[PDB]
JSON list of C-alpha atoms in Angstrom, two decimals:
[
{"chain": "A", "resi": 900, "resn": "UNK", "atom": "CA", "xyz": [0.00, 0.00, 0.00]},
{"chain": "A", "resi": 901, "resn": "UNK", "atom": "CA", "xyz": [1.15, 3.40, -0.89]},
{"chain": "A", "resi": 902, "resn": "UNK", "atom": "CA", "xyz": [0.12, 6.53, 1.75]},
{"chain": "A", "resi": 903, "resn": "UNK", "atom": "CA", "xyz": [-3.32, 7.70, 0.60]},
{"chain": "A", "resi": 904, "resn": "UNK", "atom": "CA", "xyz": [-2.08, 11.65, -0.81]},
{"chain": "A", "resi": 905, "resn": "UNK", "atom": "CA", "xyz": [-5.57, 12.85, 0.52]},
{"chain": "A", "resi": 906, "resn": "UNK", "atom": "CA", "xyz": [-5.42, 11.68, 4.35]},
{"chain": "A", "resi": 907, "resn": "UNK", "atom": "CA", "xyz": [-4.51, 14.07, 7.19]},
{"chain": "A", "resi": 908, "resn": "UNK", "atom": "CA", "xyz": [-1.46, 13.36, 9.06]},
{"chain": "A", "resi": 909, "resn": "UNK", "atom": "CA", "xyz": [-3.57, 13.22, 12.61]},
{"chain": "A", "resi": 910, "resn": "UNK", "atom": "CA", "xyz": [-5.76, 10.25, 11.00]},
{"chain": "A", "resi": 911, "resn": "UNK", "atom": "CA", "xyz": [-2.65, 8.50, 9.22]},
{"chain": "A", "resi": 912, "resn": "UNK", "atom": "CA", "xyz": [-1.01, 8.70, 13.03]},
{"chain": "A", "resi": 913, "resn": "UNK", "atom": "CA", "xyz": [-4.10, 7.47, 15.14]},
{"chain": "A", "resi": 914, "resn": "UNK", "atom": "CA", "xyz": [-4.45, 4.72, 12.29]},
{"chain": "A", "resi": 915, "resn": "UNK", "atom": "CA", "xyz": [-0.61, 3.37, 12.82]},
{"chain": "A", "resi": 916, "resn": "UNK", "atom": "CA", "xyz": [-0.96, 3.80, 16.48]},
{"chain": "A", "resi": 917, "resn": "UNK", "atom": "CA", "xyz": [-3.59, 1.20, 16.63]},
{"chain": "A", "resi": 918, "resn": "UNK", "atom": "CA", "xyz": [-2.22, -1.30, 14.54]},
{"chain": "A", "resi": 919, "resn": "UNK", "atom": "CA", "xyz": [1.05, -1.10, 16.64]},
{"chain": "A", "resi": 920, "resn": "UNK", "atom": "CA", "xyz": [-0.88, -2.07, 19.47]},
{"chain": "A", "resi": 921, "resn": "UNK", "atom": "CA", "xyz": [-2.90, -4.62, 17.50]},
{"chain": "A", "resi": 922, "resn": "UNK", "atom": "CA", "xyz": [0.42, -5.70, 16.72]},
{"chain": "A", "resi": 923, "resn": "UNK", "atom": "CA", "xyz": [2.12, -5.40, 20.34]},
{"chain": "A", "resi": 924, "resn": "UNK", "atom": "CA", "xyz": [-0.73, -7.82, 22.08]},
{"chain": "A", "resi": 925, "resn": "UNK", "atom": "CA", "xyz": [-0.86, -10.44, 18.92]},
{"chain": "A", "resi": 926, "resn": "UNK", "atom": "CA", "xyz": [3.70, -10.14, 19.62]},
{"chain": "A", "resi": 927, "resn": "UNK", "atom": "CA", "xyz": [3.42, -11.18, 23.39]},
{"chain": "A", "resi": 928, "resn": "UNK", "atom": "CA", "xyz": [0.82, -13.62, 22.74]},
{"chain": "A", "resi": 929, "resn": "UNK", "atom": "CA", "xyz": [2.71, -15.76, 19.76]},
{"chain": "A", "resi": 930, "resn": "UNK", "atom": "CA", "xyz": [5.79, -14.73, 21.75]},
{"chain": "A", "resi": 931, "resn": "UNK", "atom": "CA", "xyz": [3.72, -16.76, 24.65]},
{"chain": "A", "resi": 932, "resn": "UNK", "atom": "CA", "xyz": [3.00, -19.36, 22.59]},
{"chain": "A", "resi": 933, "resn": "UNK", "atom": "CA", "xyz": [6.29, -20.11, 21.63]},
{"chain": "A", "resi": 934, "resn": "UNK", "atom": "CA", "xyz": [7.49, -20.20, 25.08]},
{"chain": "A", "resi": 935, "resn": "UNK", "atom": "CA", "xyz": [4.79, -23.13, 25.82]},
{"chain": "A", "resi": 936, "resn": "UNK", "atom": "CA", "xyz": [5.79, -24.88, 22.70]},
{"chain": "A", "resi": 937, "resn": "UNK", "atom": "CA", "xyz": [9.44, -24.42, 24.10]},
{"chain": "B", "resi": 302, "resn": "UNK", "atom": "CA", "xyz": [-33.71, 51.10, 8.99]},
{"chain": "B", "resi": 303, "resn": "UNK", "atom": "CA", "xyz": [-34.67, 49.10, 5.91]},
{"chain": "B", "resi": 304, "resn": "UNK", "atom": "CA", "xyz": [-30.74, 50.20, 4.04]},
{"chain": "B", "resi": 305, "resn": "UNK", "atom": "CA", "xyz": [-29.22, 49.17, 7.36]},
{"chain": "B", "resi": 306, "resn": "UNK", "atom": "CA", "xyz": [-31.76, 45.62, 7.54]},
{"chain": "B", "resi": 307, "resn": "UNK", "atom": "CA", "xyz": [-30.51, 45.04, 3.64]},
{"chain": "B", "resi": 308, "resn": "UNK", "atom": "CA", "xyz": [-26.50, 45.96, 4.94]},
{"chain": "B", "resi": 309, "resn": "UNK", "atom": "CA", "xyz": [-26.51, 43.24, 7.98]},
{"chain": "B", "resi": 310, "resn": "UNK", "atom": "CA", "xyz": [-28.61, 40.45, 5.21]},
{"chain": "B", "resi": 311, "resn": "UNK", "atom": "CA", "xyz": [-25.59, 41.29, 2.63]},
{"chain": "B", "resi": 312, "resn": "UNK", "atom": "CA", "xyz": [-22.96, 40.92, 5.42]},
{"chain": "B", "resi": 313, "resn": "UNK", "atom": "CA", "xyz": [-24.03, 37.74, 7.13]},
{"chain": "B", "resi": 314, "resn": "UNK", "atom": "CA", "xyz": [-24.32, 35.94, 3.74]},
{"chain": "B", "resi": 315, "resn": "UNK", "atom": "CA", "xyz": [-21.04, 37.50, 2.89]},
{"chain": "B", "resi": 316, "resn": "UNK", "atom": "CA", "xyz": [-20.14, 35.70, 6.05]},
{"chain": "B", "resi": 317, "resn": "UNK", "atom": "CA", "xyz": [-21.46, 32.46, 4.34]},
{"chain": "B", "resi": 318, "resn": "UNK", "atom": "CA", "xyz": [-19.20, 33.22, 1.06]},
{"chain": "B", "resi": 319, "resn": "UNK", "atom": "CA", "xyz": [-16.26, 32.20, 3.60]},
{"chain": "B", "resi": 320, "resn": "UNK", "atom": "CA", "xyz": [-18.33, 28.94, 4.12]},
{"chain": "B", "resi": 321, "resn": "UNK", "atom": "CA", "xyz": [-18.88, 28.48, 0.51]},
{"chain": "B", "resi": 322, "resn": "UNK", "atom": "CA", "xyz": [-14.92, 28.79, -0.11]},
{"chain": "B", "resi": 323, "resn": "UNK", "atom": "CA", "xyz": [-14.41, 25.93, 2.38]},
{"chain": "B", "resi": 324, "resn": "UNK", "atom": "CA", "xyz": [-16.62, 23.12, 0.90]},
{"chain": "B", "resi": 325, "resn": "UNK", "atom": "CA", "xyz": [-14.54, 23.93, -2.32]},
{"chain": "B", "resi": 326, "resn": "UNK", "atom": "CA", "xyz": [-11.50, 22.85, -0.77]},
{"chain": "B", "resi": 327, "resn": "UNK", "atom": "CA", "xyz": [-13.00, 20.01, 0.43]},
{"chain": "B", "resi": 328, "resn": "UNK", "atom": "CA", "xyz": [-14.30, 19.17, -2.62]},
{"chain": "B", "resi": 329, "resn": "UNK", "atom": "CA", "xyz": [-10.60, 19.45, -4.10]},
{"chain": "B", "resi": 330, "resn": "UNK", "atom": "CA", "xyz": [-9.75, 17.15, -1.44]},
{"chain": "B", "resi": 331, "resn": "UNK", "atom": "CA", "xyz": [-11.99, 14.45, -2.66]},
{"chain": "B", "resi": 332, "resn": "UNK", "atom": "CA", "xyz": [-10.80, 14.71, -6.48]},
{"chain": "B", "resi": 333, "resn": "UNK", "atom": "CA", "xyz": [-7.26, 14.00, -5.07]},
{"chain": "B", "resi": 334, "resn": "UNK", "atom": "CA", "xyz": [-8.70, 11.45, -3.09]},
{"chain": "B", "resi": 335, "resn": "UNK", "atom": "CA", "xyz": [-9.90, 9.59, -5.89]},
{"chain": "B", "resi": 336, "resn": "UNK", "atom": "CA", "xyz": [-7.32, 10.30, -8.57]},
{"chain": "B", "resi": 337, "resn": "UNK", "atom": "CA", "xyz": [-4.29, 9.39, -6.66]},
{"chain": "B", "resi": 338, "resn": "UNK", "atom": "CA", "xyz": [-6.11, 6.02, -5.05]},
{"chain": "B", "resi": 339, "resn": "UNK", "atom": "CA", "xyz": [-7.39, 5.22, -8.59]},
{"chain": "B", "resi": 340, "resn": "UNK", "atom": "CA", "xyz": [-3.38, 5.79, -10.02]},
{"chain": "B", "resi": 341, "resn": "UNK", "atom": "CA", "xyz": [-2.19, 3.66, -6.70]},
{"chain": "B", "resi": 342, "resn": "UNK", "atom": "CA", "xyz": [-4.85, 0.41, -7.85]},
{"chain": "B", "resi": 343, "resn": "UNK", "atom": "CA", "xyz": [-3.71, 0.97, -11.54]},
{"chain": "B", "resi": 344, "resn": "UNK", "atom": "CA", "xyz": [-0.12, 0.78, -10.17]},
{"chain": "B", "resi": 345, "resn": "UNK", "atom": "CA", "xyz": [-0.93, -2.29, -8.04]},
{"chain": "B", "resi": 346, "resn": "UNK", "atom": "CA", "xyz": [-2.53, -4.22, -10.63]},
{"chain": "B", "resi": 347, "resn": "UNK", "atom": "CA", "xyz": [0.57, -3.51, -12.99]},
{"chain": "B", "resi": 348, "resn": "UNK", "atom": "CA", "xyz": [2.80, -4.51, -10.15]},
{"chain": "B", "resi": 349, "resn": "UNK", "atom": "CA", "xyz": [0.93, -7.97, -9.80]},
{"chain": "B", "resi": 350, "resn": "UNK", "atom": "CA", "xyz": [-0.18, -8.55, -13.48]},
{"chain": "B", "resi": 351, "resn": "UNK", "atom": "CA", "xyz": [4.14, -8.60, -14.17]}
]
C-alpha cells in the first residue's frame, strides 16, 4: 500500500498507532505461545 | 432602517461566502482522493499482473 495523498497526518497517526498495538498484544501472545511450545 | 436591515442580510451571507470557499477545498480534497487512489490500484494491478 502506498500513503493515501488525501489523508490528514492526525488520522494517518491514530491509524498506525492502533495497529502497533494490534500488533504489540498479537507479539506477546505468539511470543507466549512459543514459550509453551518451548 | 430598511438600508441598514438590507447591509446586515448582505454581510451575514457575505459571512457564508467564507463557508462556501471551504466546501470547495473540500471538494478538491476528494478529487485528489480519488485520482491518486485510482493511479495507486492501476499501479498495483501492474505490479501484480508482471
Amino acid at each position: 500500500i502506498g500513503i493515501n495523498e488525501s489523508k490528514l497526518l492526525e488520522q494517518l497517526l491514530n491509524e498506525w498507532v492502533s495497529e502497533i498495538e494490534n500488533q504489540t498484544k498479537n507479539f506477546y501472545d505468539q511470543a507466549k505461545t512459543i514459550f509453551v511450545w518451548d | 432602517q430598511r438600508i441598514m436591515d438590507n447591509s446586515q442580510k448582505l454581510g451575514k451571507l457575505m459571512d457564508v461566502v467564507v463557508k462556501l470557499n471551504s466546501q470547495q477545498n473540500a471538494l478538491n480534497q476528494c478529487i485528489d482522493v480519488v485520482r491518486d487512489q485510482q493511479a495507486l490500484l492501476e499501479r498495483s494491478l501492474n505490479a501484480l499482473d508482471s
